[PDB]
């Protein structure tokens, strides 16, 4: 085996070892005979022969001595594949510096030479002179010199001054650079300098010189004297029809550098002057430039070609960005494609396959059975038999294909269910048959879609397609526990018609003995399909595992409902069949059958439903006719009544009573109110349209209309689409974003007009234009999420951590959205679950929560249980299986080796193709009011007004859990009712959001202090004595004298004593912001909590992708740094700085905010660092470094789910939190002491270094760190392996960094092993890597 690949600079002694000869002549072929000659690019002396075991003379052509060498010439005999490994090298007269160290922005030569990028280029082009080895001279090495300046330097010095110009002057300095002494000059001057731009330059000097020596690299290895050549097989000359041939673009670049090298190799003894010796060297330096990379600096061109030459840098990158063309696509054998075709007579664990494809895909397998049987001994005789297609070939073709599974997959694959193995069955035709039930997972319809096919060969692959990739194993969806093999539209429609109940039908009131006797009466024609009968059933209950009991029970059901029970196995009760059996009813039936009986009986039950669904649907005459789209008689009454009301509104617009800004709102609100009035009258007529008559008077039942059956069953169609056929369409949206005032009155049945049809095109073309863009954005979103979750493979079975996250149901809003049982289903418990009473335990340890424990926790009043999240379990190199939840496809726990990082990124990008007031508090439920995190003092009047901005109103039910939790604003007046039952709809708060309430806890006489008339306060009143108060002045509109003065209305006692609030020595004072209106004058008594002053106050793929990139919004919310005292900054300084002074520890440091955004200008209040100050979008960067890591993970899952729940999809919380673990792997260090000051290290790397250094005598060698959140684009490049960073993007910068550092790569990832050829360490390949490390660890 092999591993530990290295990247380093090539030495001049090592290049001469791989080479087999020296090339000096550009001639490589002859025109008389197309055979190579000696000393050429395609020569046979250095490289291999043109054919196997041949030479130029042709004397020795035997196979006895393959390693012998020819004596007539220098070309030896060898194989044909030897031309790919042998290579040569050219001898240069003058060394030339490479371009890899100068193409990147930080020049690798300039950082080690203390020079700039332009200065290092001026020396190589003979444009300026430099001095080296000055010694006892005033000239420096970094300083430049001209032709006249260097001559004057030799006159004043006389000696000890050597000025060299060219590439040899640069190489002469690298040999005597003194890297061991150069680091001492920067380290000794480290504490001397104090600058920001000088400290960053100092960190890059020490981090690169340390890795330069620790890797065994040499400084003289940067410039290369010789240049290796590519083997000739990678740039061949293949002739084509017409006597013509083709030459690669690389052959012209090598020819240009060889002839110019010989022109310099022959001008070493001709006494060339200085005018030409400086230009002939630049002819060779530009040739190496055009060979390495083009388009940046040189951009060389050739004849009859506008595109630049494809250099060696452009051939490895190719198209599709930085990703190579071989990695994006690779052609495979034993494949094919055809048109799909639905087949109802196929089993679930098999599929169809044409005879013409099975004969070509399994061609090598047929040759193995004909030789083993004894029919054809020679493989040539068996080839002629399979082409003639005799009757004997079809016998062995069906024999070799009996249990060999094949693979089937569509062209676009977004999840793991795209590739499912099937068992091929020989059919007749040219199409590939597919099972009708597995089409929901493939996301493909029978409209011309083409699916691929693959054939496994080895024995290890046949066992893999029968254990994991089989169609019977991947029943549950990887996103949620709901099965994906749920009956589709056509079979559900057949089952919905079967489970029906009619008031009057043929064969009603009869009594049947058993299900077999009831089915006999239906086939005879004496009993209808849906009729009220009385049958006796025989069912088995499985309440106790391992025992099955039988019992007879007579129920009142229909004939159709009794026939469906013959399909479900006896393990399930009868109550799961007596329902109407809609689409959602069968989805809960398979999910219940999967967790009660097992899997062997579920596949048979899921297959038998398709047979009984199609058989009873073909007997039904379900057809959509014109008479099915009924029109209610109330449609003409609502339209004629709405048309008369609009005529009253438009007539008032010409008089001047109503404006145009309000007429647009009244028209869109009148037709909208008329749109719901038609829909309510239409559905009420369609649901009770059928009227049956029995025993005299008629009765009403559910209508059996063909259109209503497709909507009630939910098989195909929606409730909103019915409003477009038999009802009015309503208002439409314009492309600009507005809504047309006049709606479309007619519908699809009555026919649209020429102008009404033109309106519906605006919304249709915009919908067809979005489905062409979501295919590119969703495909780009799933690529960034999977590139950051590849190295996360479950490898441990027991971690031992005691941390987790608190789980609570969706209590926000009026009602609950997501219950607790649907959130902790499959997640193990973190700590012990406690009863409402003390000294009680429910769950002893971290046991896996299953369907049995969900009902056990729902009976109790427990609502806040802590679980183990992937954001916890800080172990390195994977995530433990204990903290990880249950498997999404398998009902048991996650096994060791399943790559949960790939299935987590695909579950997010899979549904991407489908995704595009506050005045008073009115509760909707009743219960005891419980306040949390709210500090409200008592009120003398009894209103209990709370001026705190932090608080929430929560009503508790009879069980003790908070059913509804609302948000309480600041300055809200609410009356407490703790311990009393509240009625539904009772008002609890009567706050006003138009004016900002200002209250003071101090109760007494208030007097304004520090208020100046004409500067801070202005005596301005309203007209006709409307408002007689004192209006304050603005901070910018005030004078220069009243700019630094801030009013402060202090509250004291009425007798003259200073009153202060408990807790702080600073007395409580009333705030006086700008443009405030104080109704109560100074010197009057004010109640506690009263109003002091009066101050008036996207969505889709770009929204979900913004949370993973940590992109800061345009308007960020302003918060507080450290809790304490809140104040207002100086208005004259131009920067509002709210100073802080906590009671425990005073912090003189503070922050400054610009005057562009105005928010919380109240002078004197609490800080509430956790509570936001400026309303708006919140950035995830400030939340992590302020509160912690538990709230950031809770905020991401909450905001992401609100975007997916809008469309209707349901994604588990395990996949959202899995990506959060990889983005929180990088941390920053403030005071290291053992490493650099500002560097990027992993959290797991800092924890192991901290724990090891604590075990010492000093016990203080460790340091402190801080968690920082990074985006998905920045976290992908922060990897140790250069292969994962080169395949993502920008393979040029990562390839140069690994050269000067000398990193040793350890192949232990997923993307690193797919390019080398070894097995992946995830899945079944973990057992192979376990034996490799065991053998390596032994020695």
């Amino acid at each position: 085996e092999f591993d530990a690949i290295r990247i380093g600079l090539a030495s001049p002694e090592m290049i001469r070892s791989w080479s087999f000869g020296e090339v000096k002549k550009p001639e490589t072929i002859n025109y008389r005979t197309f055979k190579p000659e000696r000393d050429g690019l395609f020569c046979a002396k250095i490289f291999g022969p043109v054919k196997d075991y041949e030479c130029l003379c042709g004397k020795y052509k035997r196979l006895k001595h393959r390693g012998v060498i020819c004596e007539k010439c220098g070309v030896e005999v060898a194989l044909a594949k030897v031309r790919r490994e042998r290579m040569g090298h050219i001898e240069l007269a003058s060394p030339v510096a490479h371009i890899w160290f100068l193409k990147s922005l930080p020049s690798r030569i300039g950082l080690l030479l203390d020079m700039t990028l332009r200065d290092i280029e001026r020396v190589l082009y003979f444009e300026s002179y430099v001095v080296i080895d000055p010694g006892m001279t005033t000239l420096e090495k970094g300083q430049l010199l001209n032709d006249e300046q260097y001559f004057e330097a030799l006159e004043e010095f006389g000696d000890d001054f050597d000025a060299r110009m060219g590439a040899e002057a640069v190489h002469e300095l690298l040999n005597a650079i003194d890297l061991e002494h150069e680091i001492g000059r920067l380290r000794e001057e480290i504490p001397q300098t104090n600058s920001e731009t000088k400290i960053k330059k100092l960190s890059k000097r020490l981090k690169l010189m340390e890795a330069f020596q620790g890797s065994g690299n040499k400084p003289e290895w940067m410039v290369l004297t010789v240049l290796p050549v590519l083997p000739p097989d990678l740039r061949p000359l293949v002739p084509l029809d017409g006597g013509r041939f083709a030459t690669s673009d690389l052959n012209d670049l090598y020819r240009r550098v060889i002839n110019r090298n010989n022109r310099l190799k022959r001008l070493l003894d001709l006494a060339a002057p200085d005018i030409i010796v400086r230009n002939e060297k630049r002819m060779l330096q530009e040739a190496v430039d055009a060979l390495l990379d083009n388009g940046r600096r040189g951009r060389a061109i050739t004849g009859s070609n506008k595109r630049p030459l494809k250099s060696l840098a452009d051939m490895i990158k190719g198209k599709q960005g930085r990703f190579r063309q071989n990695l994006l696509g690779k052609r495979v054998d034993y494949s094919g494609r055809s048109v799909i075709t639905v087949g109802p007579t196929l089993r679930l664990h098999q599929c169809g396959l044409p005879k013409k494809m099975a004969l070509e895909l399994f061609k090598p397998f047929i040759f193995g059975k004909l030789e083993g049987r004894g029919m054809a001994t020679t493989i040539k005789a068996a080839k002629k038999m399979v082409e003639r297609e005799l009757p004997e070939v079809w016998d062995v073709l069906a024999e070799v294909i009996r249990e060999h599974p094949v693979l089937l997959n569509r062209a676009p694959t977004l999840h793991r269910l795209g590739i499912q193995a099937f068992e091929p069955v020989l059919i007749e035709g040219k199409a590939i048959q597919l099972h009708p039930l597995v089409c929901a997972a493939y996301n493909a319809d029978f409209d011309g879609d083409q699916m691929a096919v693959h054939v496994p060969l080895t024995l290890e692959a046949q066992l893999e397609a029968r254990a994991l990739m089989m169609s019977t194993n991947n029943i549950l969806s990887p996103a949620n526990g709901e099965p994906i093999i749920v009956p589709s539209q056509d079979v559900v429609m057949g089952l919905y018609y079967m489970t029906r109940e009619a008031i009057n039908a043929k064969g009603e009131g009869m009594a049947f003995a058993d299900l077999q006797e009831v089915d006999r009466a239906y086939r005879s024609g004496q009993a209808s399909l849906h009729a009220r009968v009385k049958v006796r059933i025989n069912e088995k209950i499985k309440g106790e595992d391992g025992q099955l009991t039988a019992n007879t029970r007579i129920v009142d059901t229909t004939v159709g409902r009794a026939l469906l029970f013959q399909v479900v196995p006896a393990g399930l009760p009868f109550d799961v069949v007596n329902q109407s059996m809609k689409k959602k009813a069968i989805s809960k039936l398979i999910n219940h059958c999967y967790r009660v009986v097992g899997l062997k009986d579920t596949v048979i039950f899921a297959d038998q439903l398709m047979y009984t669904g199609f058989a009873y649907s073909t007997i039904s005459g379900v057809s959509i006719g014109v008479n099915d789209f009924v029109i209610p008689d109330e449609k003409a009454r609502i339209i004629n009544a709405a048309t008369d009301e609009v005529k009253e509104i438009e007539s008032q617009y010409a008089s001047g009573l109503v404006t145009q800004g309000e007429k647009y709102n009244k028209v869109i609100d009148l037709w909208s109110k008329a749109n719901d009035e038609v829909s309510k009258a239409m559905m009420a007529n369609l649901s009770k349209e059928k009227v049956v008559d029995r025993e005299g008077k008629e009765v009403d039942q559910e209508s059996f209309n063909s259109m209503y059956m497709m909507a009630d069953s939910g098989a195909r169609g929606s409730a909103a689409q019915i409003r477009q056929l038999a009802g009015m369409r309503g208002l439409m949206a314009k492309p600009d974003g507005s809504i047309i005032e006049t709606p479309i009155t007619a519908n699809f049945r009555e026919g649209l007009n020429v102008l009404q049809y033109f309106i519906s095109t605006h919304g249709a073309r915009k919908g067809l234009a979005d489905t062409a863009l979501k295919t590119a954005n969703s495909g780009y979103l799933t690529r960034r999420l999977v590139d950051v979750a590849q190295d996360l493979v479950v490898t441990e079975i027991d971690c031992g951590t005691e941390h987790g996250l608190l789980m609570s149901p969706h209590i926000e809003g009026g009602d609950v959205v997501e219950p607790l049982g649907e959130r902790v289903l499959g997640r193990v418990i973190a700590r012990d679950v406690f009863k409402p009473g003390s000294d009680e335990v429910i769950v002893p340890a971290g046991t896996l929560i299953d369907e049995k424990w969900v009902d056990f926790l729902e009976v109790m009043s427990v609502d806040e249980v802590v679980v183990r999240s992937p954001i916890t379990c800080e172990t390195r190199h994977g995530i433990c299986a204990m903290c990880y939840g249950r498997d999404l496809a398998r009902g048991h726990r996650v096994n060791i080796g399943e790559a949960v990082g790939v299935i987590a990124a695909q579950s997010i990008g899979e549904p991407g193709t489908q995704l595009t007031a506050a005045d008073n508090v009115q509760v909707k439920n009743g219960g005891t009011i419980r306040l949390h995190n709210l500090k409200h003092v008592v009120r003398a009047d009894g209103a209990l007004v709370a001026v705190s901005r932090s608080g929430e109103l929560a009503v508790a039910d009879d069980f003790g859990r908070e059913r509804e939790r609302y948000k309480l604003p600041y300055g809200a007046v609410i009356s407490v009712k703790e311990g009393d039952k509240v009625d539904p709809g009772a008002i609890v708060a009567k706050w006003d959001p138009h004016t900002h309430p200002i209250v003071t806890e101090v109760d007494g006489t208030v007097a304004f202090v520090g208020m100046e008339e004409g500067i801070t306060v202005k005596r301005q009143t309203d007209e006709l004595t409307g408002l007689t108060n004192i209006e304050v002045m603005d901070p910018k509109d005030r004078p220069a004298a009243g700019k630094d003065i801030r009013p402060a209305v202090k509250l004291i006692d009425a007798a003259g004593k200073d009153l202060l609030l408990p807790g702080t020595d600073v007395p409580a004072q009333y705030f006086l912001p700008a443009n405030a209106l104080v109704n109560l004058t100074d010197g009057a008594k004010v109640s506690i909590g009263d109003v002091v002053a009066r101050i008036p106050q996207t969505g889709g793929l770009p929204r979900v992708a913004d949370l993973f990139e940590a992109r800061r919004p345009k308007e960020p919310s302003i918060l507080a740094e450290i809790s304490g005292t809140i104040s207002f900054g100086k208005e004259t300084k131009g920067k509002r700085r709210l100073v802080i002074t906590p009671n425990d520890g005073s912090d003189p440091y503070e922050e400054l905010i610009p005057k562009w955004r105005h928010l919380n200008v109240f002078e004197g209040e609490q800080v509430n660092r956790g509570e936001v100050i400026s309303d708006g979008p919140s950035n995830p960067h400030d939340i992590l470094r302020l509160l912690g890591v538990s709230s950031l993970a809770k905020y991401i899952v909450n905001e992401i789910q609100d975007v997916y729940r809008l469309q209707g999809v349901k994604i588990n919380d395990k996949h959202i939190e899995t990506i959060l673990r990889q983005m929180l792997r990088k941390v920053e260090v403030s005071e290291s002491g053992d490493s650099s000051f500002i560097k990027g290290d992993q959290v797991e790397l800092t924890q192991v270094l901290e724990e090891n250094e604590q075990l010492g005598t000093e016990d203080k060698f460790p340091a402190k760190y801080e968690r920082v959140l990074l985006g998905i684009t920045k976290a992908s490049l922060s990897t140790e392996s250069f292969i994962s960073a080169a395949s993502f993007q920008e393979t040029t910068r990562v390839l140069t960094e690994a050269a000067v550092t000398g990193k040793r790569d350890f192949l232990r990832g997923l993307k690193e092993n797919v390019v080398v050829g070894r097995l992946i360490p995830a899945g079944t390949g973990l057992a192979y890597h376990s034996e490799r490390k065991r053998q390596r660890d032994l020695g």
């Binding site: 249990e403 290890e460 066992l463 096994n895 057992a1327």
Partner: protein
């Protein structure tokens, strides 16, 4: 009758080491090293090797001792 790789995966409850014991077991039947205990079902060697795991006739220590 047919091979049941779904219930057999629930006995070991691994679904990852089951294919490892089945690979070395199915290779001995194709090369002719050992005769299967269960009668031949006129199927390939990859099918009989999976039925012996659920029956309990072979194991990790049993397949190692046969080689």
């Amino acid at each position: 009758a047919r091979v049941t790789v779904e219930d057999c995966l629930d006995n070991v409850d691994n679904r990852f080491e089951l294919v490892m014991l089945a690979t070395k077991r199915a290779r001995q039947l194709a090369t002719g090293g050992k005769e299967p205990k269960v009668a031949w079902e006129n199927d390939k060697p990859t099918v009989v090797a999976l039925r012996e795991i659920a029956s309990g006739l072979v194991d990790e220590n049993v397949v190692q001792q046969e080689d």
